[PDB]
Amino acid sequence: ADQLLDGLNPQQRQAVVHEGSPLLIVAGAGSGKTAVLTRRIAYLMAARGVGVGQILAITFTNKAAAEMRERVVGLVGEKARYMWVSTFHSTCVRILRNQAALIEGLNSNFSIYDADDSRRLLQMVGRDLGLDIKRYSPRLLANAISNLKNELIDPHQALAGLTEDSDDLARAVASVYDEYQRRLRAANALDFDDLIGETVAVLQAFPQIAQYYRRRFRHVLVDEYQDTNHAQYVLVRELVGRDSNDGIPPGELCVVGDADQSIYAFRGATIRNIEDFERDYPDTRTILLEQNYRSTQNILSAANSVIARNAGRREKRLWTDAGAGELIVGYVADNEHDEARFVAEEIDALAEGSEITYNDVAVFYRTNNSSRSLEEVLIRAGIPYKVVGGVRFYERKEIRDIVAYLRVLDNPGDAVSLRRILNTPRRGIGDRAEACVAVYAENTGVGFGDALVAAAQGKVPMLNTRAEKAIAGFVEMFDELRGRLDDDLGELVEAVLERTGYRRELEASTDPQELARLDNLNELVSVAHEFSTDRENAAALGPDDEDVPDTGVLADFLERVSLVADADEIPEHGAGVVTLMTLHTAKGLEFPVVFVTGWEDGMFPHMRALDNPTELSEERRLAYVGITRARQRLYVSRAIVRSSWGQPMLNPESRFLREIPQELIDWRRTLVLQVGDRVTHDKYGLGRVEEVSGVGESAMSLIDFGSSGRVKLMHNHAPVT
Amino acid sequence: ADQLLDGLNPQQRQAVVHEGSPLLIVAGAGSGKTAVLTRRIAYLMAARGVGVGQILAITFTNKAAAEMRERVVGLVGEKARYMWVSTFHSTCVRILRNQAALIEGLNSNFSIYDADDSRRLLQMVGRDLGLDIKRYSPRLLANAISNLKNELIDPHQALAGLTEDSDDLARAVASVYDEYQRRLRAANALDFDDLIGETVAVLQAFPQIAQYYRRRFRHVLVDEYQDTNHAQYVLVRELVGRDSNDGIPPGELCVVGDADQSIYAFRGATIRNIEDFERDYPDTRTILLEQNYRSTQNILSAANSVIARNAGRREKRLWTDAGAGELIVGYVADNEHDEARFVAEEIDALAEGSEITYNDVAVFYRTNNSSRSLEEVLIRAGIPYKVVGGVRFYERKEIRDIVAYLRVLDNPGDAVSLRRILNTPRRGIGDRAEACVAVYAENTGVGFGDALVAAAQGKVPMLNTRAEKAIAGFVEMFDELRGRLDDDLGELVEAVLERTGYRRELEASTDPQELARLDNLNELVSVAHEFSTDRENAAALGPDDEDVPDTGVLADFLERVSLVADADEIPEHGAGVVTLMTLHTAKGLEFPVVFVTGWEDGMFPHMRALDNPTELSEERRLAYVGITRARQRLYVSRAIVRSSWGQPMLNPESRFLREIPQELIDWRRTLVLQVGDRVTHDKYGLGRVEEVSGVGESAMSLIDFGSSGRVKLMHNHAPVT
């Protein structure tokens, strides 16, 4: 035992004790679902005495499985030798290896392939059939293959649908899927994704192995049921089907999860999986967890109100016995820089109370592109910062490629930078560096390694016609960029993008990672333009021709970028450090004080979600899971104007501000025209801001025009650029 | 409180409760040191109420640290966020990175270097100074650098020792050490080993950082103290020293371990570290754990007897309250194959009792080369087997290189095999540094797979003179080797080894890995000779072939090796699979029934240990840790004769047999001359064995000579080849 029971609310007590028929439970926002799961496991071991080699608890991530097994051992004892707690892929590969030689055509010594090996195989497929660089990018093909496999589509029936849709791209992807599957089976190995589908197919087709495994299993559990797509759901249903002994011994399948925290639909997860769980299993019982002890009442009520606006959702009201807690102090800034300044100021003010260190404060943003400005202020005020699930803004690979292109554009003498960006966009015809083409410097240090003009003329005789034409095009593009050096450097970056074809490839890939890369690079363009403007107005005034040749030459810009990059001496979490991350990786963590940035429509609800209802609901659930990360203090920030593509866009407040309980007016309390900043107006000329006063859109800015005097103006109605 | 105490013998009770002054405890063989450690930690937290952010527990491997953290979480709570339980390297690197901005020249942006980058850098250094292809192999240099650094040797004072020893090699290694260290610091990076020394140096040199960290830490825990070399011991002593306020704030130290299980001296661990622990800490107390619950009394007594003969050892007698258990089966075989047959037969017989499966039986061998025969019989009787800490015999890289050499010698048109062996047996100046030469010949030319011969005459003009000189010698020596196909297979393999320089460079490196590789190569030669005998003369003569052979080529050997290369088709630990491993990786595991192979002097007491007393004592401790792995059955096997390096050697019984008292070993049980095997005698001619009777030295073999009749003879006194 009763010690496991007399410490919990009766809801989880009844969830633990109940054993007849399959069970379902809704895990509320931080309602200790892991604790309830392990306590139920201990009660199962102590009362029903389940076989240690028969009980199966499965998860999706290694950390959760490790924590579950550790807590079970600390609660009931060390029996992990026969007790199994693993993830889907680990359990699947272990079970398949147990019977890996009983399948004809599939070697029991099969290996695994990463993305590079699959890319090589698919490029061989394409060069056998077509061309994998125009409209047939390897990443798009791989993603399509994985998504089609995730729905249990056999290669033999895959070619039966190409004529049904009557789409050329559909026919091409079906044919390449069939070829890839057959030549991968000819390669006596598989990838990291098709193993689940192949295991399901083998268990369905071979009856004796299915009967043996059904005899081998009696209990099956599962966690975070939302992420389970169709394929793993089918696997679990087949591995828990009660047709072996007709249920003479009970088959315990209880599922923990909550349909309202499903944010991983980008990997193919289906929200229908749990919402129609009752339809698949008519003999199930459901129970809700409406109580949690992690957050305060105000934040909990706000999250519950914001999540209830979806149309099709199971009713669930959260509550807690703790205090009301502090309010939700929203903020409105002049721009992203003003917002970063505000959040840095608030972090510093709250840290100077000796109650919580920097390690107790977390900041969330929707996308990586909205992470530069914050870092800047966080590197200016001196407060240490660390980012999880990624790298610094200047440390990402796309901005690295762009700055390397700029470095090459500065002087031709660079070698590492030029060698890194030779084949960064594959481009097919236009540049090529595989098959030891990149190593062609004649293996002799004739001057410095460039070739190029030597490569175009034919210094290296091993280079075929295609490669020499590609290198000639590359050097002609380089010469054109050299000759274009006449305008502002932001337009220079845009010209680089349009010449190199990076932007078109990024937009046509149509992947969340590639979309993030595109937005990040566009933000880099905006940063370059902002630096150019700041140097041109505040510092140049009369720019003429200084020691720095032009207004926005790459010398000073690259020097600034490098010196900011060479500043990683900031201490890590050894001392009090602040944490940064994106919303998609915020699941499973806990923090007492949280800030959220970019809380306006258009940005937080992306244009990809403004139309499709599924994406709208998914991002609303994402906002819910972001909100419920706080414990006692949660702050929201929005920016009236933000720069993108080198232009200032206007974005209203998000529709999520009204969904939150209005309560007292809290969003206006506690591009940009800061002290010393110079801006331009089409009718008034140039002006320098003197004083910054007010909070939110109520702020009126005083600008001295020099000869034309001082004028006080607004920010949204005055056409200031 | 008292619950942690009223379940244990009073020895560990007193070890747990005792808290004043530093404490030392001797952890007996399987005395549950981890459980006692975690219970003491829980009692420390509950009674003394030590601060969570001040208590430090350290380990050396991730698995043990994870287990200890699991026990802590399941026993005291989830305060793991403020207490660090990690390895030496991880904790040290985190500590140095937290304060990484307070050291000039060293910045936190440094990237750790694997063996590849260090190898490249030192190769460039050698090119600058000497030549790394002869007498200056990168592996030997890296090992020497790591070993010299492990003893806290400053690079500046390293120049002062080169003139003292007056050795050219010593001066060279000191100079390259200094050059490598300064060039690496110019590269703002460090290797995986110098981090400990750098942390020690920084903590010693900078007083304020040392004072801050001394104020930060209050408790320090360590496990498996034997592996602690001099450098990490100095680090621990400095991090626990009371020099912050000149002894005002005391330190807490409790050290677990056992000087009699120290087998990792090959990595530089010092047995003097624990045996002289009292000298450095005169105010400590020691306590022994003479009781364990894992093994039976007979095996425990055998281990106690065998470990007692070391002259310098703390007195420790193991005992247990369990039953006497079974005896010890000491088997003597005719040769290696006979021993493998015996162990397979015993495994099968013991498995057919439904008491234990194949997962409860483990077999140990001193070196990898003593596994081949075993695998063979384990693939013949059908019992599945898996290997921990390595791969199958035919899956290792050295035998892979030699079999690839053989395959290329068979088919001159092979491509993958020829491309793998060009540079992997590092020759460089010998054969070639780079890899892609076919692309020089018009990508592939007119199917020019064998472009090497065209490159020898120098048809490709873009290659340097040194590379073509190296390639010409390679192709000429390969052609010369191809013209000697009129000998036996074993002599052919030995000729390949001596011509390719594999043997000399593998021998001269003087490291355990390369010694294992050399022994592996000799075992491969023995296998080739055995197959040649079985296919050419033995069981291959008579009216069927007479004196004229059947055009016996190496293709038969190649196809046999390829066919038996399917040993990875065996299932992994998901089924009833037996385990194979070497002695050095047997620490920390547990198994019910164990077998040990190769229990003769010259093999188990290695040739490197017959002279040096330190190696002799170390291998005796290795025998102790191997013996104490059993739980209820431990069987020892030895072979009177064995083939090594292509020749049959005679090795007596090891001195460890007489070490165990000759009343607890159930002696005997129920190159070789097996049924159907043909052998040769210089005086009697050829003979075919009919009946195999007896075991070991009591066995007498009956051989029919055909025309000369049947004769019964012995094995050790009849010169049979």
GROMACS .gro file of C-alpha atoms in nm, chain A residues 67 69-71 73-74 78 93-94 97-98 101 108-109 435-436 439-440 442-443 462 568-575, chain B residues 66-67 69-70 73-74 78 94 97-98 101 107-109 216 434 436 439-440 442-443 462 464 568-569 571-572 574-575:
model
   58
   67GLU     CA    1   1.454   0.692  -1.649
   69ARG     CA    2   1.384   0.144  -1.579
   70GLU     CA    3   1.588   0.330  -1.316
   71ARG     CA    4   1.276   0.435  -1.126
   73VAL     CA    5   1.443  -0.069  -1.013
   74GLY     CA    6   1.456   0.188  -0.733
   78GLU     CA    7   1.665  -0.495  -0.996
   93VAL     CA    8   1.595  -0.495  -3.420
   94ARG     CA    9   1.645  -0.723  -3.118
   97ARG     CA   10   1.786  -1.055  -3.484
   98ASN     CA   11   1.635  -1.327  -3.264
  101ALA     CA   12   1.801  -1.620  -4.046
  108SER     CA   13   2.082  -1.223  -4.115
  109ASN     CA   14   2.404  -1.018  -4.150
  435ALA     CA   15   3.522   1.133  -5.819
  436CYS     CA   16   3.840   1.311  -5.706
  439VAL     CA   17   4.155   1.724  -5.560
  440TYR     CA   18   4.267   1.854  -5.900
  442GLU     CA   19   4.782   1.888  -6.030
  443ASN     CA   20   4.922   1.785  -5.688
  462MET     CA   21   4.228   1.443  -6.688
  568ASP     CA   22   3.304   3.149  -2.775
  569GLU     CA   23   3.494   3.209  -2.447
  570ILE     CA   24   3.158   3.258  -2.271
  571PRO     CA   25   3.124   2.997  -1.993
  572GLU     CA   26   2.877   2.711  -2.032
  573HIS     CA   27   2.627   2.571  -1.778
  574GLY     CA   28   2.910   2.528  -1.525
  575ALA     CA   29   2.805   2.870  -1.395
  787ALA     CA   30   2.493   0.535  -1.482
  788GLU     CA   31   2.422   0.245  -1.247
  790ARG     CA   32   2.321   0.739  -1.050
  791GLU     CA   33   2.029   0.499  -1.096
  794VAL     CA   34   1.782   0.840  -0.792
  795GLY     CA   35   1.588   0.533  -0.680
  799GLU     CA   36   1.620   1.320  -0.808
  815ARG     CA   37   3.333   2.039  -1.799
  818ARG     CA   38   3.547   2.464  -1.993
  819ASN     CA   39   3.350   2.643  -1.720
  822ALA     CA   40   3.805   3.211  -2.038
  828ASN     CA   41   3.998   2.927  -2.550
  829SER     CA   42   3.674   2.732  -2.508
  830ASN     CA   43   3.631   2.712  -2.887
  937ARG     CA   44   3.305   2.479  -0.448
 1155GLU     CA   45   4.659   0.890  -5.207
 1157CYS     CA   46   4.238   0.767  -5.679
 1160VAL     CA   47   4.031   0.868  -6.249
 1161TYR     CA   48   4.360   0.988  -6.398
 1163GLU     CA   49   4.015   0.906  -6.837
 1164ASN     CA   50   3.789   0.837  -6.538
 1183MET     CA   51   5.033   1.419  -6.395
 1185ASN     CA   52   5.491   1.280  -5.936
 1289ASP     CA   53   2.779  -1.291  -3.859
 1290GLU     CA   54   2.456  -1.464  -3.968
 1292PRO     CA   55   2.173  -1.424  -3.399
 1293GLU     CA   56   2.280  -1.177  -3.131
 1295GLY     CA   57   1.822  -1.193  -2.830
 1296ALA     CA   58   1.825  -1.574  -2.813
   0.00000   0.00000   0.00000
